[PDB]
Amino acid sequence: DILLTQSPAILSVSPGERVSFSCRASQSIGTDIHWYQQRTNGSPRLLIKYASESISGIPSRFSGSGSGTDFTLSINSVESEDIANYYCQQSNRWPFTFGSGTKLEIKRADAAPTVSIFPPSSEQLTSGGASVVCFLNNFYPKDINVKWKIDGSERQNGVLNSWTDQDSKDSTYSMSSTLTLTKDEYERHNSYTCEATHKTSTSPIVKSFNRN
Amino acid sequence: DILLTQSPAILSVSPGERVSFSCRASQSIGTDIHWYQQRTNGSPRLLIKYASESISGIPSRFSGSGSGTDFTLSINSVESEDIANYYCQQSNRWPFTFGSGTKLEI
Amino acid sequence: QVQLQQPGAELVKPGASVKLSCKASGYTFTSDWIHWVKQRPGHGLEWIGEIIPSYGRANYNEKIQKKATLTADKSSSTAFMQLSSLTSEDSAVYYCARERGDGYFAVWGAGTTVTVSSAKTTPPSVYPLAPGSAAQTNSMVTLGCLVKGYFPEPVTVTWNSGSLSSGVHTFPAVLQSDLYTLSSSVTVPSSSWPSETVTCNVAHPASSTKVDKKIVPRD
């Protein structure tokens, strides 16, 4: 079967710049190559068909080129909405096959995180639980560390973090640190703090809140 | 003449696991590849013909795939009776040729 | 209008076997082929098989273990895929797409999330997240709502039934003892709250439940 090689796997580029992903077929497939876009959690979307033919509804920003074994999908002037995974697919010979995929990644200006701390909900406490949510939104680079402190004392148990893939709205990243305790453990403690340490500033950004 | 490369030479796998031997032809042979099994002291036994067509009497466990120059013989869920040597053979161009063989080892 | 419709999710016990659906609408020709692609989390697209409704024939990917059986119901315009004896390995998002016989996938379905576990289907619990009483604020305000204790994936979190799109982050769920947990974050002008209601819509296809939860300030 035909093998479609997509390298590099990840592409980093500055906003507005021109960018190109390559797709190499293990054998000559004419122009029977097609390009698909897939953003975080969406389904694939046809960008270019038959190597260079454009589809309607696709920003004139996207073009295709190539023939035989070497194909290129270019984006003249990249922008946040372009952050996704790009795949190539051939219909020259059966069975149709797909490329391994190339992730487009934009490099934007440094942005410090927007921290927000949230005290557990009453509806939740009403059922024995207590979750202290903290958001580290729209920062960049994506390297960020979050520290919890219960009554001035660093906490590390019951903490589960979650990061978002690069945002396709502004090329930033966001993280959600969730400190989960029982109403009990929560009832017997004063202040809850969430400290964020990010390249944007030596000083750690912090948000606290006392149960009363 | 067409050269059939079978590497790795030896394959080690845990019982029940899935396993695959590869066979590479020095040139495009379509699907004119066939697979043979040969246990210790027995004669070869046809497993798969024409790259993917199954033979009757062969555990549904054995499958084949590939076209052109890259062919694969897979065994879904290996078991002791599968311990043997596996060879590939092409009939695309004269003379028919054989692969060097791959020993399955559990 | 949405051309290929597929059930949001399907829970299956190891060894069991679910049958996915994909119903089409719009122009349907005799040259149409419906394909099925499998996408394991984090990995790429893997072609599973194809079927030509107008005739009923289907072909499958030989490089992999055949765990699917494609069929098509002419009258209802629905293509079906029967996956049998699944395992953790079979858990993934399965898409169906339509190919006009010219080689490329014109349109894809939203895909069906298939999770193969022993765990039981548990609807999600939604709690509000409003700033604390002593948190000052500027031009924008960050509200959000927590979705926890659900299984299996996924959950779809919209804000104000979709009207409020700009400023939303719906973090990837974390798993812990057969139950997922995630949070969604929304940011609106601090002036426009709570005068204008901000509600988070959480849908969990696996349990056939979609619940609302308005975000009002703390007492």
Place this chain on the structure above:
Amino acid sequence: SALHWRAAGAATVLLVIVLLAGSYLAVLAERGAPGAQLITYPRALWWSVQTATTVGYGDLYPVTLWGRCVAVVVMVAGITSFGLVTAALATWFVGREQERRGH
């Protein structure tokens, strides 16, 4: 209207039908066979036409038994159709040469 001319006409409508069906059947038969290229309608149509006219460039051809069976039918239809036209042109020339002499 003379038979030879009716046949010629029929032969043409027929050939067209065969080309179209041939294209469809070919793709249907070829898909599922690794390495097959006769797998999309547009080119299949181009394939059948070049097969019916017996030109066959080799850029496309069936590799499965049913595909080849479909090819034979197309080849034969194209050959018979075009031959039937030649035959009609002969009956026309023969019939009119008899005129240029009297009968």
